[PDB]
Amino acid sequence: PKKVLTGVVVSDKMQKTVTVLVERQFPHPLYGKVIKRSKKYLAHDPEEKYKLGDVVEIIESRPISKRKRFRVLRLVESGRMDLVEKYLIRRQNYESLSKR
Amino acid sequence: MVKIRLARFGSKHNPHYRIVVTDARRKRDGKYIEKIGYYDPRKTTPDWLKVDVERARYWLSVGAQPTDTARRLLRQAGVFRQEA
Amino acid sequence: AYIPGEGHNLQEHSVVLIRGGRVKDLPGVRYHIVRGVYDAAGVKDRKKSRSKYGTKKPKEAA
Amino acid sequence: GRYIGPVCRLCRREGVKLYLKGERCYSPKCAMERRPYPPGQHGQKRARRPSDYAVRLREKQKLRRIYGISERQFRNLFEEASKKKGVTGSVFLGLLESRLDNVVYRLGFAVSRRQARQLVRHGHITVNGRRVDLPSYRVRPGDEIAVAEKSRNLELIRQNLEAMKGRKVGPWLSLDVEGMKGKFLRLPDREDLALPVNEQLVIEFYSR
Amino acid sequence: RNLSALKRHRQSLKRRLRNKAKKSAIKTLSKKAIQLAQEGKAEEALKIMR
RNA sequence: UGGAGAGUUUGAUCCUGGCUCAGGGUGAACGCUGGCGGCGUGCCUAAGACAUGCAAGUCGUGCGGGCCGCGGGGUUUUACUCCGUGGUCAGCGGCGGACGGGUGAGUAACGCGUGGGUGACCUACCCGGAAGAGGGGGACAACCCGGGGAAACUCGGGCUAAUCCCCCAUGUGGACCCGCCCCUUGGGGUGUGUCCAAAGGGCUUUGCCCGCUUCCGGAUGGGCCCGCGUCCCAUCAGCUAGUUGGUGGGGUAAUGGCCCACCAAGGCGACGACGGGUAGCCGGUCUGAGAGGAUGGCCGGCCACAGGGGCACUGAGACACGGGCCCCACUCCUACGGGAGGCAGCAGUUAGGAAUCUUCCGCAAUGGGCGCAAGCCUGACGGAGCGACGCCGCUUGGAGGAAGAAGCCCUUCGGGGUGUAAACUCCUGAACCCGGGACGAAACCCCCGAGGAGGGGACUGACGGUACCGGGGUAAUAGCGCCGGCCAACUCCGUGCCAGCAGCCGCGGUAAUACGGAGGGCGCGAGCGUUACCCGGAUUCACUGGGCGUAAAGGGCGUGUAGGCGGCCUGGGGCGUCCCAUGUGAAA
16 A cells, blocks of 8 residues: 555656645644645656646655655646645745844 | 463462463563463462463464473363374 | 751751741741751750651650 | 540540440440540530531541541542442442441441451451451352351350340341351342431542 | 683684685676676676676 | 532722642652551662672584593503593584663654555574485694793694585576566566585484475564654744756665766745754553643663774674774783773662662573583572562450549639540450461473374472461550641640741730640541642633733734635535444553
């Protein structure tokens, strides 16, 4: 049983490798309300036959690179970049608060 | 290698053992993978004959070994026995 | 560090064992003394708290 | 231990007399009738009022008194009774009398508590065949508190026997004065073999 | 003072004497392999392989 | 089926509100006390230092023997040559030293708890399996001779064999470059060119026993990825230069930039990266009413460290506690050139602290290393001992016995009281000795069948003449705390804001139930108090369970970013959800 998860492909900016950003569910132990958080698994694309936006399925494997675990199976869908949009927007807003 | 022994658990002076199988490394008091009975040589009550013969003959067919009074117990219950 | 009550014994040292209890003054008070150890030992005239006011057993004896 | 000494001097302490020192504590005085009220210079002033917690406490202490025991084993076995999944207090009452000292007392073979305990301690009693010494011994429905063979050949034991022949047993513990013995059965209660107390008061102060 | 630590270090020596002797010999023979294979000749490089 | 609170602010009142005590628990410590018994437990402080005893030994069914010594075989005998040889020593070799064992320095980390991955793998001691086991010889130990050395021991030539060590053969087979079929990230089968074996010893004897050689699978140990959860300070806010990524190598039992070259810039981060602190994690453990706060010793596991760092070599496997290299630091030994020693493995010494144990017994039981077996090792283990350190069992006694002795405390002197208490009586038999006495111990082995079953002869007890059975058996330790309110127990001289009490309000500013004592009394009893520490309480960090109009507290208002909550119907996915089925949730 090798565990997989439905993740949103990001960063084509690498050679033969894409980095998938995923968001998983869980309520709360002793409070309630469900939650959805950042976890970006490493998407192994042999000839960059995948890129930005295009959501796919990701697959846990053996260590292929420096921390790079996981891999990639079947593609899900294109016409995207919306989730990606939200993501990097959040990124800039990260780099919008300072102690200087 | 996996062996079989007798695991006393009683008080300071309560010779009441649980007949136990597990491997050599582990202590006489730790985690028993298996087990399969109990023994009381002191005889406070004739409950002291407890062996699980099925898994016994099996677990000896795979590659376990007895010990001293375990050789004894095994010859008792009918695990060494064969009635030709 | 204070003690139980009236009637001291020490000159210095004593190994007085810091205990621990504020009372209605000495902004802190705290950390009273064994009374027994290497000094103190209750006093010489108490008929009760010998469980820390020293004196083993008064024992009328005669 | 078990107080011992000015015993039923503490019978006026309760303000109430009891089958405690046996003879000199039933007939015309438990050190009573002579004078019944809490001992010491202060006894018959004009008393005040004990708070709920206090009176309920009192009741508990009275319980440990009639049975004559440190509240050690007592309290422990009380929570042990709370462990048994039945109505805690009452179940506790049955399993409370069940201790063989005052059991053998109200079974006959003893005049006083001190007696019963002293005797069983000396190996004078054997339940269901085995001669022991333990008085703090609870017994299951169907035992046989037989007496020792030399203890039948003793005297004050016979005195206790004949100074009884005319008393209905606690409807379960049959008296065999045929060879000195007692047959043990069932489980009574605060309605079957009662006593002048309120149990759930004690229970209510007990655990707060 | 003593203990059979003597034994084990002695014999560890021995088996390492042989070990490293043959080990280094074989390293050097592997150099032989790369030169002869790189050249484009077999037969004797094939002997190397034997 | 599982739960109670009060005190304290004001003249008085209710609410808000914090601090305090009622409770359980703990490695405890001390002060008062102290007796037998059981089962447990019993340095947390300097991971300071550690003297002396055990921890790791074993095999002669692998081999060459040196020696004490024996029958002294041979020697008609000499001196002694050597066949048996009992006892010893080490040497080669094989097996464990990688288990048993300790303890928190390191560490917030896939380390742990945990449900899975390996088509990315290794595992001797047991099993089922297939082919078998020949040929040559080489080297050094030991030993033979000789040198130095206080010692550590160190040196040069000669001998000798062997489950020591290689070279050719044997190939069912393994494994490899190239090929293919199914399987789909190097999993299976199979061809063409290649390599390797093995080693044999001992008897009861031509048959047998231990071991081997190849090869796979099975049992285990474990390795390495992952899904989740996993401690305080954001006054720790940005951060990274093997750093993100590749090809191609090297590396390891195995994938990965873990090491290397080139080339290309990302990489993670407010949901908490970078870092300081802090701690080893878990089953659990005390409380709690429940959810939770806390923490993690004995007992069970995992992680890691052997003074301190780097280290390889070795073996199946370790960077190895009782191994060595280097280094630094550190004690001790010496004939002064030079040498060695290391217990955060079990007892003990010192300092540290208020504080925490014998430098004893047995291998008998179990149990761990080797051996054909007996057996030798055996601080794993089984116990005595000690301290009330805790709980459970408990004795110090039972019986009658006054209108109430006396001693004493009080008083309006009437007595109340102490106190049936005692005294006196009848009573049993603690402790103590005498007779006996365990279990724990039937194996293993031997004889029998075959060495397989079964039966039968049998070593085998430290604990300790102890739990206990019988006899004789004698009345024989009681102490601590409170007595103003929370609290149940008050009468009497003394004390005069002085001497003291003190968890919180307060008590003595000479009529003190709160301070001393006396009496009686209340709680308890080998226990009683006092202090340190977590929590229920405390709904007082408010999830069941909070507040912000004046009691802590609404942003200076606008504003919109991430984020969260989404009006009415139809269907679609069915991630979250729900029930049902199953693996686990170990043991204790």
